[PDB]
């Protein structure tokens, strides 16, 4: 069960949303490569409500955003390859 | 331009694994079956869950795209994206093979 999606516009809604868009961003170092993250860093990476910073890593998860790996005791995340492909808009969105 | 090919499986395992997910989700399937159309609170009436809690789902499904949102008169109603509804074909794909 495959579904074939417009990614843009998402790319747009996720860019219209305050928080979403930084805690998208977290996860790229400035060197414009991505990176791995647990949620506490992100929690810190972004001045934002711990919980909404947490609610928004969770919902990222589910949509399919970010990847996730257990790493001896916690969990680390790095983004899937649609992440990086919401990234790549918005990398674009930028230039242009 | 920017096409990209979501598993369907996987998103609805995830979003089965999230209770307010689920149900914010279903809220669109009417009795009959059909797709139909809400407004943020009648969604949070038919949840048993913090307001709140189904605001931010609603919110989020709608930026995931699940979900679409029409102007009406004086009110923003939310109805299900086609990818919403792969979404909801799939959940009900798992239950139909089930009985």
Not at 29 to 55: C, D, H, R, W, Y
């Amino acid at each position: 069960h495959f579904y074939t999606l417009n990614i843009a516009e998402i790319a747009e809604r996720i860019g219209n949303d305050d928080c979403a868009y930084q805690v998208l961003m977290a996860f790229i170092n400035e060197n414009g490569e991505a990176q791995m993250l647990n949620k506490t860093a992100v929690a810190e990476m972004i001045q934002l409500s711990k919980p909404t910073v947490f609610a928004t890593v969770n919902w990222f998860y589910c949509a399919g955003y970010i990847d996730e790996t257990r790493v001896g005791r916690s969990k680390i995340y790095t983004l899937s390859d649609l992440g990086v492909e919401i990234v790549e808009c918005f990398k674009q969105k930028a230039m242009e």
